[PDB]
Symmetry: C5
Subunit: 238 residues, 5 copies
């Protein structure tokens, strides 16, 4: 019910955690693993009041990673507890952590200075689909970007928004402000049924003048499929 | 029969996976190894209906690698399943991944604006030989490249193509558009019986003005021999 | 404790550790005895150094524990850290970070206008169990070429944009050149991260930010809880 | 053999290996049997390739042994190297870098003065068990942008600075572009490392050096000796 | 003699760092104490051709426990010693963590300095017991080597000028390392007061030479100087 209270509202932290599965996990008998999966489900369900957790299968799409959590929380302290709890699970004890990025979502900064025609197009909701592809791209702006005045950056971001608009219907997007919580300024999240559209989306943004201000683009670029936690861990049950 | 329908048609994703074999693999008794090899062979044959898998021996040609998969599929979802099954396999659980790159094939962008004399020579298929050397080079363009207009880049790529033409008869080439699926913009793939030609090919392309725009060239530069999957896995028995 | 967190000439070390998998393969009572060994080690050193504990687990990747050790002589800090890694607990820890930084009298403060000076004597965030952020910084070559005046001016614009955060963000600077691969170690306590997030974005606008060659890497983030509260979470 | 160390069209492969900890857990007798397997494999391949060995243990970090393998085709080098790492000894070896480079007939020497051409025909240093250095090199985009005359002139300046070291430093160059991540592989033999050192700083003065985008990384240093004596030293 | 390696030129200097495995603590204490005794002798057995000094980097430098500063007239001898050491039972529980060689030479630019500066330079420095020790590798940019002998000489005089007030509290040593590894220089320092050593470096960050340092540190090795036995004693129980 309060699902969207975290996915859209501001002041909401957003955390990306990646995990890789150890070798010993398959030494466990199939029965012992199926049980282990249930412990996680409950931990998530027990935490379903304070946070929100969505899972993605990165195995075979992203290098050196199997599982990613997108955890929403009113405070990062709560996410700290959950991740510690998750890694304390018998399943989690057979997981080696592989990267962690936090980012708080905020109300738009440059959109207000856009054309009223452009503002409208942005209210085109996007792509709402079941089990879509998911992409995560961290970004760091160069010192030059921050030196610019508010009007200049606003105009640059209008050029940014303009090139992306014809992909709004097929590519969902969300932005996390990450500066000061790690080594990145932004975390970008995307959902798509057609990866070819998302690709064309990116080269289209390679055309704008904004791209040259990106000191860091990707590294790592997390690609994966979106699916309920049960089916992912089920694939780990064999 | 259904084979060439993927290697030439557009919309076909192409995935490159590299693996290295652990030390613990040789601690395993031979009997355990022969079964592990057998588990892999059938699984590949089991997946021969939805995708295409070719194997390459990087052992002794590429550092920290023994095996490379060139997997073609209309959807990355299928490739994700295959790779996940493969790395869960008893052989695969003794494999460490060493890079993973996706790239969708596309309809040529600059060829249409070429001289008709150049277009024709490009339609020359190339040299078809058995068990050739294979090189894979990922490439990332600098921010300047994407800033240029359609005419400048086109002229640059004609200068590119021009230097490459005398190698068409001895070097097969194919290009995958990779931006947004990982940390690279392109994936280049080559087959040749003559490595000395491939070398001369590259320095010839080092002279052109396009080359200076490659922020990343190689890293890693994958070299290997092309051969059936059985023969590679055969070497891990004994 | 005030002698070490305030005075100059007091070194500050930042040790980061991550726990092994096979630590959880150890029987539950062994972890208890292990934890009990560490407290006695810190206690025997309390008369020479000051050890503060942090919990990076679930906030800072490839990290579980962080120490902030203060000592007027770095030798004392060396004996301790080798001993901690010698302890049964420490033999199951892969250290992944170690930064030293001495404290010194302010360089560019006296040059500042005294309106700003008085605002720097203003208390600051006095919180309990707050978030903690450690950022290492390396200046470029151009920075050190600039004369004192040109640099003192740049730190004025620096101190300026930071003033609205002084009450919600605690700060401490460690001079770290020639002890590791960074020039400065910045340490911050705060109950509000969005506040601290603002402080950085605000500081990104000054021209002094241009002269930061290495910014972050790694950017450590965790909660500042007492030692026992972190070690009790380990035995389970 | 000498038809391979000098003729053009000859591929040259550099393989580095590090010895595991588990190898020394093995009793001495178990190793000697393993050593014997390698000797035969080399002799079995002595028809299609040529193999020279180097002791990097204690001179280059994270390395004990290096192979310099000459062959007209890399496939043969591939078979040998794949077989070698399958050897009982090779199953206790972790691979540590691999660089190929085909030898070709000189490009710029022809445009040199005959006074310089002659001095280059001075064979070099022939010594027993000399030091050996291997340096991979990548040229910047600017170098390849130059037309044929400047590079020719630049390499004449290169050759000029190197001449007083010909009698004490043997050298050979491999064209490596397209087979890995480097453009060239340089190989040197010298009884006097101090000579080789003075040689390198002498070449740091020329205008060519600035066009070297990548210089070394890794820089392989080692001693040259028969394969038997190296492997024997890995015994007991 | 004893002194022929710490001052003379043509003497190679090698820096080897090692980290201690986890399996080392699986061994019973006495078995380790014996291993310590084995190492002591190997050093003394080699005490004729080379010189070995040891440093504790455990808890001061990341990912390192022990460092050797080995001086030898030939690198071949140092190669043998390290191979024996890493083959030693203690050494089989050691993982190597970086290796840099550098030959000491007679000064290149000092001759062109004022004798007022030369005199102050003849002050050897501070000889103290168990001082801190710092190792900083350095690589100069291509621009530096493009400069003529006079400019570089003047730049190095500016370097020397800034360092002088630290001569009495900071010992300095320079190794010419180009061609033996991936660095051009290796710098070694001893001081009882690290606070002095810090001020020394930012003072040297002001000069125009510093911008020519393509690589400065990476890694920057810090540690304590002490006899090999007392260091190894800590690796026993
Ligand atoms: C349909 C796709 C997209 C749309 C509609 C879009 C639109 C926008 C808009 C309106 C903003 C302003 C938000 C604000 O006021 O702070 C923004 C910010 C941003 N976007 Fe996107 N964008 C899209 C795709 C992308 C992609 C593909 C990337 C990176 C791979 C990206 C990275 C960023 C970053 C880093 C910012 C913050 C810029 C800054 O404030 O410095 N966006 N985008
Ligand atoms: C050997 C024969 C080769 C031929 C016939 C050839 C031809 C071409 C042609 C016609 C294009 C235009 C693509 C389009 O129109 O959309 C192209 C693109 C490209 N080629 Fe090649 N090429 C060859 C070798 C190579 C090599 C050796 C490399 C790199 C080592 C390379 C790297 C690339 C890259 C990165 C592009 C992407 C163009 C872009 O950035 O937009 N090619 N090639
Ligand atoms: C409430 C927040 C902050 C306050 C009140 C503050 C204030 C100051 C002041 C007054 C100085 C001058 C030191 C002196 O005179 O010796 C200084 C130095 C410095 N600060 Fe901050 N600052 C704040 C936040 C930050 C942050 C967030 C960072 C980095 C992410 C930072 C990095 C530095 C650095 C690198 C220096 C020394 C630069 C140099 O000497 O070259 N500060 N700060
Ligand atoms: C006694 C010492 C040396 C001699 C006699 C020597 C001589 C030569 C000559 C004559 C050439 C040009 C041959 C041709 O392509 O026609 C050459 C090429 C080259 N040398 Fe050396 N050289 C010496 C030292 C070095 C060293 C120390 C290095 C690097 C560490 C080096 C790196 C190279 C490279 C990268 C090229 C080819 C560059 C290009 O073709 O773009 N050389 N050498
Ligand atoms: C502490 C007292 C120091 C003194 C008295 C001193 C003095 C000198 C002198 C006289 C030379 C000339 C060498 C020659 O003639 O060949 C020299 C070279 C050099 N020193 Fe120092 N120095 C000191 C500290 C340092 C420090 C702290 C560093 C680096 C962190 C350093 C790095 C270097 C380098 C890289 C060179 C060789 C530069 C080149 O030839 O390109 N020195 N030093």
């Amino acid at each position: 019910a309060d699902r969207e209270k975290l996915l859209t509202e501001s002041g909401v932290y957003g955390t990306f955690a990646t995990f890789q599965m150890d070798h010993d996990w398959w030494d466990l008998p199939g029965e012992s693993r199926v049980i282990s999966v249930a412990e996680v489900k409950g931990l998530v369900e027990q935490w379903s009041g304070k946070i929100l957790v969505e899972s993605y299968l990165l195995r075979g799409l992203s290098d050196h990673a199997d599982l990613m959590f997108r955890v929403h929380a009113r405070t990062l302290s709560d996410t700290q507890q959950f991740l510690s709890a998750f890694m304390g699970t018998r399943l989690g004890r057979h997981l080696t952590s592989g990267g962690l990025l936090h980012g708080v979502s905020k109300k738009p900064t440059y959109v207000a200075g856009f054309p009223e025609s452009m503002k409208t197009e942005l209210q085109v909701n996007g792509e709402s689909g079941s089990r879509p592809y998911a992409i995560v791209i961290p970004i760091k702006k160069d010192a030059e970007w921050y030196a610019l005045d508010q009007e200049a950056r606003t105009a640059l971001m209008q050029e940014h928004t303009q090139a992306a608009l014809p992909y709004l219907k097929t590519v969902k997007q969300k932005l996390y402000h990450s500066t000061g919580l790690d080594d990145v300024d932004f975390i970008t999240y995307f959902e798509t049924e057609r990866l070819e559209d998302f690709h064309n989306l990116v080269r289209a943004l390679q055309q704008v003048k904004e791209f040259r201000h990106n000191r860091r683009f990707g590294h790592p670029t997390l690609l994966g499929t979106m699916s309920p936690l049960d089916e992912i861990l089920e694939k780990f049950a064999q």
